[PDB]
């Protein structure tokens, strides 16, 4: 009965669908303005290096589901996602002289492949399964568990919890190559670094826990 009167009438499920939608279109125009700060400037933009804490307002009938420590995890994945959209768009908006372009495809590929992995293979696989699960909610408690078994797993597949200084930092430091090379528009000293860190990336990730092989091809 409770789940029945909770689909509408304090529609907790409807609110949940919007949550994972207003981040993870609309949010494309929002970030592009940030590329070219102030704390009030953003609000009118939204209503239209690692910060931008985002929150939301939830009514009491759904407060018990989307807890306070649940907002931060949803915020955690949003921060990291933008840095990927950043590097992906920074190397995209533009269009031994031509030798730079060979450093573009050798790089614009790699960040693009990673982005194809986090969003499609993870942020859409578990998402497609989660919706098929909540529509069979039959309990006050288990709806928390099926939900809590969606963040604590999406925070693991997207490598952000542990093994950060062992694996995650590698993707982080090579992301700085997406910033340095973007501004300049020394060249030989980039591939010596790039061919090293990229090989450092594969020769470290080679330990593969098993789902990492979906990107290990490149």
């Amino acid at each position: 009965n409770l789940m029945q009167t909770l689909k509408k009438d304090y529609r907790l499920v409807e609110y949940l669908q919007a949550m994972r939608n207003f981040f993870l279109d609309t949010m494309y125009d929002f970030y592009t303005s940030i590329f070219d700060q102030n704390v009030s400037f953003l609000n009118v933009q939204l209503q239209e290096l690692d910060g931008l804490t985002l929150s939301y307002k939830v009514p009491w009938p759904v407060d018990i589901v989307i807890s306070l420590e649940c907002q931060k995890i949803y915020n955690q994945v949003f921060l990291l996602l933008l840095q990927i959209k950043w590097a992906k768009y920074s190397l995209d908006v533009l269009l031994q002289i031509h030798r730079m372009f060979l450093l573009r495809v050798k790089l614009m590929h790699f960040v693009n492949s990673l982005h194809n992995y986090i969003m499609t293979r993870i942020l859409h696989s578990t998402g497609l399964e989660f919706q098929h699960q909540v529509e069979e909610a039959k309990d006050l408690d288990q709806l928390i568990k099926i939900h809590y078994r969606y963040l604590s797993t999406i925070h693991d597949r997207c490598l952000l919890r542990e093994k950060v200084s062992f694996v995650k930092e590698a993707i982080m430091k090579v992301l700085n190559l997406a910033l340095m090379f973007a501004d300049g528009w020394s060249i030989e000293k980039m591939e010596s670094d790039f061919k090293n860190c990229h090989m450092f990336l594969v020769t470290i990730l080679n330990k593969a826990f098993p789902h990492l092989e979906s990107l290990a091809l490149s």
């Binding site: 009965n1 409770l2 009167t5 009438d9 009938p61 408690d141």
Partner: peptide, 26 residues
């Protein structure tokens, strides 16, 4: 501190009791 008489189903009680209290307020 608990009678095992109703233990094999106790979980289905609490999860029904508390869930019912949140219904009368709505």
């Amino acid at each position: 501190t608990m009678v095992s008489f109703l233990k094999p189903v106790l979980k289905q009680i609490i999860m029904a009791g508390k869930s019912m209290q949140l219904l009368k307020n709505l």
